[PDB]
C-alpha cells in the first residue's frame, strides 16, 4: 500500500520473477506479480499450479501495509529505466503509483484474491545444501535431458536419496546417453530409507539461476520446495518410475583408456565441422579421428599422439556421436578422462581421471 | 592449385565473404567461393547479378597456379577449428585438400566456369574517400531506411553528387522521417554537373562491414564499385527517381529550441517503457514527457529542468514517435540538439547544436 525501496533490490527481484509469468496476455492475472507489504518487507511472488517463486526485499521506509498485484514485465521495464535513488511504491485504489524524483508512473492492479495460494508442504524428505555440489551436478547433467521429451519421466532429473547410506544419486537421460553422479556424506532427514523425486527440466533451469549453496531442499513426494534467505521456490514433481539406471550401467569394462580431455575436445570439434558422427581409432601411441556421416567427397581427419602408451593389441575402432562425446567431456573437471569400453557395438563410459563428478554412459555409432 | 596461407588471413577473408553466399543449398554454385592463385596472391570472390565481393590474401608459398571453387560456409567452419600455423591448400582433381600438421580435409570443387563474371565498369562518376565521413553518414542514416520497403527507390540511400559545388548529399527516408547530410569539399570527378545513385540497404550494410576510409567509390549509373587495397565490392543500383528532398524540407521554422540530448534520450526511453508515442510539452524552464498511446490505466511521466530558458509564451505541445525521436538523437555527435518546429501538426527538424552531421525531419503525432 505504501513504501519506499532500493531500485537495485527491486530490479533484481523483478528479473528473477520474469520467468514465472505468462507475459503475452497482459489482461490475465498470470502476467502479474503478487505484492505484500508486512513489517519492513515487500514480498513479491509469481506462481501457478506447476511452479513458483516467492522473494522479498527490505523496505527503506514503510508507511502502509497491505496487498496488491502488478504486471511484472511492465513493472520491470519501468524500474530498469530509473536512476539508482530510492523508489516510492504507493497504491491509489486499484492502481500502483511508482515515483522517483520528477518521474511518476501508474499501472493497474488486479484483485489479489485471484492469485494462486503459494503452497506449503509437510516434508517427507529434507536436506540442507551447504556447498555447490548439487547445483554443479544439476548443471553438468542438464544437457542430456530433453525438456520437450515425449515420455514424461525422462523430461526431468532423478534425485535418489538413500537415507541408510547418506547418498544422493542424480541421474539424467535421453535414452541414447545417461549421465550420473552419487554424492556421498549428505545428511538426509527422511521418513524412508529410500525415496526418489523427478524434477522437471524447466524447474532445473530455474534452480540454476536462483540457487548456489546454503539452501534447503524439501519434498513431500508431490512438490519440491527449495529455500534460502531471500527466496522460496517450488515445482511439481513428475509422477512415473524413472529407469533403473543401476541395471542399465554395465558390470565391468574390457578396456579402460586414460586420455587427454582438451585434445579430444579439439579433435572432435574439428571433425564435427563436416559431420555429426566420428570414427575414433585408438592405437598404442595414437588417437585418430575421422568424420563418419559426412556427405560424400567431404572428409575431415586428425590425430593426436598418446605418449603414455595404451594397452592395445592393434587398433580399437569406435563410432561416436560428436555432440554427446563433447558434452560428456564438458561435464568433467579433470585434465584427463577415462574411456571404458566393451565391444564397439555396446555402450561405453566416460568419466573423470581418478564439485560433483559426473560420468556419462553412451550408445556407440555402428561401423 | 597449390599454396600455403596464413590461417588468420584466410579466416578473416572467409568471414567477410559469408554474406555473399546463398548457404542453404550446398549443392549450388551460389554456396561456393571462387578461388584463383596467380603470382603470390590467392583471390577469393563470391557474387551474383546483384552484389559481390572480391578479396585477396598473400600466399606464404606458391607452387601451383590455377582456379577452382569451394563451399564457403564449410571452408570457414574448417579453418575456424584450426590452429594459427600456416595452412596448405591443394587441388586433387575436382577436390580441394586442406592440411595443417596432423589435420587434413577434402571438400568438392565445382566447375569454376559456372561462376559469374565479376563485373567491371567504365565510371561516369568517381571519388576517393580519405576520411570516415561517408561511412559515418551511411551508419547514421541507415536506421531510417526500410530494406523490405514495398516501394523500390525508398529501399536504398540516395547519394546526390554536385560536381559544380563539390558536394555529396546523402539522404534516407521511410516516408515518416527523412535524414540527410551534405558533405562539403569532396573532389568529385564526373562527366555531369549533377548525378544521383541509389544504393540498396543490403549493400549499405555490407559496405559498413568492409570499408571505413581510404577507398574509391565509382559508378556508371548502373553498378557502384567500391574498392580499397584488399577488397573490391559491387552492388546494383536502384532505378527510380528518389523523392525531391529539398522540396520536402521546410523553408523556415517558427521556433528553434536548443535542448539536452542525453536528458531527452533518457526521458523518452523512460516514457517508452509504456508507449510508442509521447506527448512532449516545452515550457520556458521545463520539458515534460508523458506516454501518449499507452493502454488505459497505464501512465508514464517525467520532466527535466531547462536552465537557459526557452523563448516560449506559455507552452508548446508536440506529439512524437519515441523510436524516431531517439534514433534522430542517436545520429547526433553533440551534447545538445536543436529542435525546429512550426505547427504541432507539421514536420519538425532535429539537428546538432551548431564525421558527417545528420539532420532528421519528422512527422509529428496528433493531439
Ligand atoms: N536408458 C537406456 O536405455 C540406455 C541404454 C544404454 C545406454 F548407453 C544409455 F545411455 C541409455
Ligand atoms: N517524404 C515525405 O513525404 C516526408 C514528408 C514529411 C516528413 F516529415 C518526412 F519525414 C517525409
UniProtKB/Swiss-Prot annotation, chains A, B:
SMART domains: POL3Bc. Pfam families: DNA_pol3_beta, DNA_pol3_beta_2, DNA_pol3_beta_3. GO terms for molecular function: 3'-5' exonuclease activity; DNA binding; DNA-directed DNA polymerase activity; identical protein binding. GO terms for cellular component: cytoplasm; DNA polymerase III complex. CDD domains: beta_clamp. Keywords: Cytoplasm, DNA replication, DNA-binding, DNA-directed DNA polymerase, Nucleotidyltransferase, Transferase. It is found in: Cytoplasm. It comes from the Bacteria. InterPro entries: DNA_clamp_sf, DNA_polIII_beta, DNA_polIII_beta_C, DNA_polIII_beta_cen, DNA_polIII_beta_N. GO terms for biological process: DNA strand elongation involved in DNA replication. NCBIfam families: dnan (TIGR00663). Belongs to the beta sliding clamp family. Forms a ring-shaped head-to-tail homodimer around DNA which binds and tethers DNA polymerases and other proteins to the DNA. The DNA replisome complex has a single clamp-loading complex (3 tau and 1 each of delta, delta', psi and chi subunits) which binds 3 Pol III cores (1 core on the leading strand and 2 on the lagging strand) each with a beta sliding clamp dimer. Additional proteins in the replisome are other copies of gamma, psi and chi, Ssb, DNA helicase and RNA primase. Confers DNA tethering and processivity to DNA polymerases and other proteins. Acts as a clamp, forming a ring around DNA (a reaction catalyzed by the clamp-loading complex) which diffuses in an ATP-independent manner freely and bidirectionally along dsDNA. Initially characterized for its ability to contact the catalytic subunit of DNA polymerase III (Pol III), a complex, multichain enzyme responsible for most of the replicative synthesis in bacteria; Pol III exhibits 3'-5' exonuclease proofreading activity. This is Beta sliding clamp. It comes from Helicobacter pylori (strain ATCC 700392 / 26695) (Campylobacter pylori). The lineage of its organism: Bacteria, Pseudomonadati, Campylobacterota, Epsilonproteobacteria, Campylobacterales. The gene is dnaN.
